[PDB]
Amino acid sequence: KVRWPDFNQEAYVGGTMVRSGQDPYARNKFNQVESDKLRMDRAIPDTRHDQCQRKQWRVDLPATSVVITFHNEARSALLRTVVSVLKKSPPHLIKEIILVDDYSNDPEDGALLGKIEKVRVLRNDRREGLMRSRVRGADAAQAKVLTFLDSHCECNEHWLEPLLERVAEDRTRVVSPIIDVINMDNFQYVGASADLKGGFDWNLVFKWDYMTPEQRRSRQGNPVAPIKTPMIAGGLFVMDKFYFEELGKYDMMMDVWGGENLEISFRVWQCGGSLEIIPCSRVGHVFRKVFARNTRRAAEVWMDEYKNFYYAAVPSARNVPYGNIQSRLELRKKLSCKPFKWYLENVYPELRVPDQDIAFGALQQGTNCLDTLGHFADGVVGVYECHNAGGNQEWALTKEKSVKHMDLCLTVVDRAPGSLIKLQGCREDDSRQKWEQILSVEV
Amino acid sequence: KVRWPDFNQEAYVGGTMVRSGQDPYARNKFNQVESDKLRMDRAIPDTRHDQCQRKQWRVDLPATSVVITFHNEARSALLRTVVSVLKKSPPHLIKEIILVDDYSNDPEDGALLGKIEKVRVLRNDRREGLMRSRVRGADAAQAKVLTFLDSHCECNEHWLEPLLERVAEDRTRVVSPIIDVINMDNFQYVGASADLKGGFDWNLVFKWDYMTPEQRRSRQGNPVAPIKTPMIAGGLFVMDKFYFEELGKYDMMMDVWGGENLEISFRVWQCGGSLEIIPCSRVGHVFRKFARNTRRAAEVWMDEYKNFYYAAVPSARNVPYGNIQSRLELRKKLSCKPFKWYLENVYPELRVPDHQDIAFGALQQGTNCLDTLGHFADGVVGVYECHNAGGNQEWALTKEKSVKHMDLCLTVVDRAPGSLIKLQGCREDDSRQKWEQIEGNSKLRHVGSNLCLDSRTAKSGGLSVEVCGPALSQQWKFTLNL
Numbered sequence: 067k068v069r070w071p072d073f074n075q076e077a078y079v080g081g082t083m084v085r086s087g088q089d090p091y092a093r094n095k096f097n098q099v100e101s102d103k104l105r106m107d108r109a110i111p112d113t114r115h116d117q118c119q120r121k122q123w124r125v126d127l128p129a130t131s132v133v134i135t136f137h138n139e140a141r142s143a144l145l146r147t148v149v150s151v152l153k154k155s156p157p158h159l160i161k162e163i164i165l166v167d168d169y170s171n172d173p174e175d176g177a178l179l180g181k182i183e184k185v186r187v188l189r190n191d192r193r194e195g196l197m198r199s200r201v202r203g204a205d206a207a208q209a210k211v212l213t214f215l216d217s218h219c220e221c222n223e224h225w226l227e228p229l230l231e232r233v234a235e236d237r238t239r240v241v242s243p244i245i246d247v248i249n250m251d252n253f254q255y256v257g258a259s260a261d262l263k264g265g266f267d268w269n270l271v272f273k274w275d276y277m278t279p280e281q282r283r284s285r286q287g288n289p290v291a292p293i294k295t296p297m298i299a300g301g302l303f304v305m306d307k308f309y310f311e312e313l314g315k316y317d318m319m320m321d322v323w324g325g326e327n328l329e330i331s332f333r334v335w336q337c338g339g340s341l342e343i344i345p346c347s348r349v350g351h352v353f354r355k356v357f358a359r360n361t362r363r364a365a366e367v368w369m370d371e372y373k374n375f376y377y378a379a380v381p382s383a384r385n386v387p388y389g390n391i392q393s394r395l396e397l398r399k400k401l402s403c404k405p406f407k408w409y410l411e412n413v414y415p416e417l418r419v420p421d422q423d424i425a426f427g428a429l430q431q432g433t434n435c436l437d438t439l440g441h442f443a444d445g446v447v448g449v450y451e452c453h454n455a456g457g458n459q460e461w462a463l464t465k466e467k468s469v470k471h472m473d474l475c476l477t478v479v480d481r482a483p484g485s486l487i488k489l490q491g492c493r494e495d496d497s498r499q500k501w502e503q504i505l506s507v508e509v
Numbered sequence: 510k511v512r513w514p515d516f517n518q519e520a521y522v523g524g525t526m527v528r529s530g531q532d533p534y535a536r537n538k539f540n541q542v543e544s545d546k547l548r549m550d551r552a553i554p555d556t557r558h559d560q561c562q563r564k565q566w567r568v569d570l571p572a573t574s575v576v577i578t579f580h581n582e583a584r585s586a587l588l589r590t591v592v593s594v595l596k597k598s599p600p601h602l603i604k605e606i607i608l609v610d611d612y613s614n615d616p617e618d619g620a621l622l623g624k625i626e627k628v629r630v631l632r633n634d635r636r637e638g639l640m641r642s643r644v645r646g647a648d649a650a651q652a653k654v655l656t657f658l659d660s661h662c663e664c665n666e667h668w669l670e671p672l673l674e675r676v677a678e679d680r681t682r683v684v685s686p687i688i689d690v691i692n693m694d695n696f697q698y699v700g701a702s703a704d705l706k707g708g709f710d711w712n713l714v715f716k717w718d719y720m721t722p723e724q725r726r727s728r729q730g731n732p733v734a735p736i737k738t739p740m741i742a743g744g745l746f747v748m749d750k751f752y753f754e755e756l757g758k759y760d761m762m763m764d765v766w767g768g769e770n771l772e773i774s775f776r777v778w779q780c781g782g783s784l785e786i787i788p789c790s791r792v793g794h795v796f797r798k799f800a801r802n803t804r805r806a807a808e809v810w811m812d813e814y815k816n817f818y819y820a821a822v823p824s825a826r827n828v829p830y831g832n833i834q835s836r837l838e839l840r841k842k843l844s845c846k847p848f849k850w851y852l853e854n855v856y857p858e859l860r861v862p863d864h865q866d867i868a869f870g871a872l873q874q875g876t877n878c879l880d881t882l883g884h885f886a887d888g889v890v891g892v893y894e895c896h897n898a899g900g901n902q903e904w905a906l907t908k909e910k911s912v913k914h915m916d917l918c919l920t921v922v923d924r925a926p927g928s929l930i931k932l933q934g935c936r937e938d939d940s941r942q943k944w945e946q947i948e949g950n951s952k953l954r955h956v957g958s959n960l961c962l963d964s965r966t967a968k969s970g971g972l973s974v975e976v977c978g979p980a981l982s983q984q985w986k987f988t989l990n991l
């Protein structure tokens with residue numbers, strides 16, 4: 067067993083370096099020459115709010131089993147992940163670090179990290195992917211609380227105490243750090259915004275957005291308070307171990323190319339827990355950039371009818387075979403989880419839910435986009451380039467066949483081609499406001 | 510006195526029509542030829558939401574005194590305003606209509622309408638303006654509730670009872686209809702949005718804006734409920750007569766040029782009343798196309814925040830505005846709340862610069878604005894056409910010299926020319942985040958460098974840092990400058 071500072075990084079990253087000519091993004095989708103240049107404990111900026119830095123963190127907290135899962139991870143990045151945990155965490159709070167080597171090409175990527183204090187390595191036989199690899203890691207953990215990280219993260223100062231404080235207080239909380247960004251081309255560590263919450267559109271791809279100005283204003287008194295989130299990124303969180311178990315771990319027939327965020331985020335909220343982002347906890351993550359099977363498996367279990375709006379948004383998924391899900395279904399009733407309606411209403415109210423529009427989003431043409439120009443009733447309407455967007459470029463075509471923004475409708479004021487169209491109050495039976503898929507007017 | 514239906518509109522109107530060749534816009538800045546063709550009680554669409562078409566008010570509502578003030582109004586428009594009040598309002602709720610002719614060139618405009626049932630006319634002596642004219646009318650009013658309208662309005666079906674119900678239930682409510690649009694060219698009557706709230710930017714110019722999504726969401730249960738509003742348009746409103754008096758009427762030193770929304774809206778909210786837009790009340794208004802009145806409002810009500818207005822309108826700082834003691838004494842007497850309380854509780858969606866911000870608002874290059882492009886940390890930044898809806902075009906230049914949006918800051922990741930700037934978490938100690946306005950706030954340069962913000966690759970990669978130079982791609986001005 068070696069203490070982390072005495073581990074031989076030069077040797078370990080030694081023979082795996084990018085060879086002249088070869089493509090540094092090739093193995094990984096990030097720049098390995100840049101990764102390999104970094105020391106395993108390289109200094110990173112303290113990105114935490116000023117208030118965190120003056121906090122006295124409790125350390126009379128339950129220890130954690132840190133589970134890190136990986137498949138042909140760059141050696142420099144894997145080691146850097148492990149050492150950030152060991153350097154930045156109170157040693158009595160790290161029971162162990164469990165590395166699940168999920169079929170890497172050189173088992174030595176993992177096994178060599180086995181000489182480090184607290185690290186134990188489990189190797190999969192075939193490639194099982196992230197979700198089952200985590201379940202296995204979790205099954206082997208000896209501590210009361212689980213911490214899951216990706217194999218290309220860098221923990222910041224006092225990242226762990228604020229997370230464990232939460233779950234030690236109430237074991238139904240599944241909590242996450244603010245995920246700082248490590249740039250995939252130059253490996254600079256970048257402070258993220260603390261004003262974000264996790265969410266998604268009806269295609270179900272995870273996305274961030276800012277809290278509303280009202281939510282921010284409500285936090286002014288304690289701006290480092292926990293943030294409740296509809297969904298976690300999924301790569302990094304901490305969860306009470308028995309809670310992870312009792313709620314059903316992860317779905318064992320998910321495969322990769324999987325969204326580790328989706329199903330667990332719905333289950334936790336519907337089945338009585340909460341998801342939080344904890345501002346004082348900062349961990350960096352290298353961000354970069356068939357899939358449908360896993361998403362299907364989540365939707366079919368958790369969303370009830372609103373699953374329809376997903377298939378609406380992504381018809382391309384309607385017949386990807388997704389397999390047997392009965393044991394996941396049994397699980398939901400066994401737990402007496404609330405319905406998806408409740409989650410939309412209570413957890414993600416700000417998600418736009420459809421219903422009977424013929425069409426939504428922007429009216430393109432094809433560089434530009436229909437735009438109110440900020441005009442109201444009796445104003446002309448126009449185009450700007452598409453910004454992607456929302457606001458004055460968002461429109462609906464209604465069951466009633468109107469083209470509307472808020473309650474204003476494009477109105478044929480004068481049939482004479484091609485005089486100007488106008489915004490006017492939407493009128494269910496006004497015929498000057500009816501449009502069909504087949505500014506000013508013309509033939 | 511004459512039944513409104515018995516009034517001869519052709520005699521009244523016909524005596525002032527536009528003649529051969531003469532500009533039909535000259536007199537009023539609207540098309541008088543189109544106005545004059547209309548019947549005095551012309552049919553207008555019912556723009557009210559279907560859910561109005563019950564609906565909800567007591568049986569013993571209080572009568573109102575309607576006050577309409579005018580200077581050289583087009584006779585046809587004036588007459589339609591009066592007949593629409595008479596035609597659309599239950600007769601027992603109209604105690605009287607008081608016309609204040611604020612020194613119109615021809616006194617017959619008003620005096621001939623004095624033959625109509627319930628109308629009485631007062632002529633100003635001299636040109637007093639709308640505010641002083643309104644106080645004169647209100648002082649004459651015999652009923653318990655005041656209704657103010659402009660002289661180019663057309664009331665719609667059951668416009669009055671929902672206004673009267675609000676104030677009969679709580680006399681500290683000052684209430685307005687949804688104001689429908691009467692087009693100044695063709696005089697067509699156009700239904701307005703019901704999703705608006707009144708407001709203003711730091712230049713103190715009134716504007717509408719859509720409610721927030723959460724506000725809309727909280728109205729699912731009753732989409733025609735009252736709408737609380739930080740500011741009223743000011744032309745049209747109903748107010749308990751005694752409450753109008755007790756609260757200080759209007760500031761009697763306001764002149765012609767105002768501006769009638771501002772001072773009263775701040776005073777009502779700060780002194781414990783409220784302002785509402787009532788969706789089931791619909792009235793049309795002919796819309797068409799100075800700092801003394803605004804200063805008198807800012808100096809009395811705004812406390813330190815008046816400084817943002819002066820920032821926005823630096824020329825206002827010179828302008829005489831007269832004596833405000835009486836108003837400050839009114840403010841103390843009524844125990845009004847500070848402007849800070851108003852911004853927090855009444856209008857939290859106005860975004861307010863930090864006390865030590867150096868500049869604020871949009872950062873404009875011609876008609877384009879610095880836009881985050883929906884990006885977050887480690888993302889590039891760019892420009893779009895300035896849309897004045899804020900959001901991704903909202904910025905501040907802070908005490909710490911950063912250009913910031915939410916808690917992200919423009920960061921110079923590489924000093925090499927043509928290097929892209931990036932959004933990173935603001936950190937006070939980060940020298941890469943420090944920027945300064947130069948050359949009369951026409952450009953932004955990275956502190957301690959020869960590098961300036963540049964748009965040349967806006968659309969093919971992002972904004973960059975580039976050697977400072979005459980290029981127009983390096984011009985940037987904040988809309989607000991402290």
Ligand SMILES: O=c1ccn([C@@H]2O[C@H](COP(=O)(O)OP(=O)(O)O)[C@@H](O)[C@H]2O)c(=O)[nH]1
Nearest residue numbers: 135136137168193195196199216217301322
């Ligand atoms: O246990 C694992 C962990 C990761 N990966 C692979 O490594 C890459 C990164 O996935 P991960 O979720 O670790 O990182 P992300 O890029 O999703 O943040 C993908 O090709 C995964 O399939 C894997 O096969 N098994």
Ligand SMILES: O=c1ccn([C@@H]2O[C@H](COP(=O)(O)OP(=O)(O)O)[C@@H](O)[C@H]2O)c(=O)[nH]1
Nearest residue numbers: 578579580611638639642659660744765797
């Ligand atoms: O009592 C009045 C009413 C109106 N006006 C003038 O009439 C014009 C339009 O004002 P109003 O408020 O009637 O209409 P709006 O501002 O809505 O167009 C302006 O020149 C005002 O000075 C006036 O001098 N005294």
Ligand SMILES: [Mn+2]
Nearest residue numbers: 216301351352
């Ligand atoms: Mn990752």
Ligand SMILES: [Mn+2]
Nearest residue numbers: 659661744794
């Ligand atoms: Mn008017």
